[PDB]
Design a binder for these strands. Sequence first.
DNA 1: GAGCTGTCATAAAGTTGTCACGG
DNA 2: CCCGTGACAACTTTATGACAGCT
Lengths: 101, 103
Amino acid sequence: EEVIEMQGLSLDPTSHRVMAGEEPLEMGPTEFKLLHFFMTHPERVYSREQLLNHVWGTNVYVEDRTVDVHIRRLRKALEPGGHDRMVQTVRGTGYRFSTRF
Amino acid sequence: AVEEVIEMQGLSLDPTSHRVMAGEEPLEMGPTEFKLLHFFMTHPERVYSREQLLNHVWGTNVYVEDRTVDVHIRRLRKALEPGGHDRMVQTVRGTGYRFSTRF
DNA sequence: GAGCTGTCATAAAGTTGTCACGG
DNA sequence: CCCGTGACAACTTTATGACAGCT
């Protein structure tokens, strides 16, 4: 597990930190986990049901639209460096994380 | 307690003298807060759990209670205010504490 | 001319899963 | 499966101010 860097956005597990350039971005633990999954599997879409599975649990109960709300917070928080652009929606399929846009 | 001095954002720990100075002003603080700071500064930009701090600073998690670390982190903070360096003792909710220069 | 420590109980702060509404 | 937001009530994790015993 190393520091993940893309488009000037970094996530270091060790320090447990998210930084847009030299600017650190505050955000709850769920979001950190969310981004941590996206950043580990970029250029791949996931339906909400797959996010709750990969991020919450194969046996978790949370409702599909819960995902949206977290994508949203992960976006409001990825704003300072304009990186919310990387948190991409895919109509009728789910969400994607990508360096392309 | 190694050899050379630790220099960061104007904050410094000199093992040799066993002293902490913000710029040039000395900073007072008990033996532990100093040991903690000595650990934090040699292991920066890396989050540690209260438990690990016990093992590393206290040398063992057996006699003290996890939350005792919060108290010390606080006292270290009050001791780093003068030069404004209390900013480097950062709380990583649900994970512990971390020492960092990037804020 | 004291300076330190480890725990508590308590007040604070930051999170979370859903909703209702709108776009 | 349409998705994105701002608002919530409850819940969980931290920061403090004391406190009494010791070194």
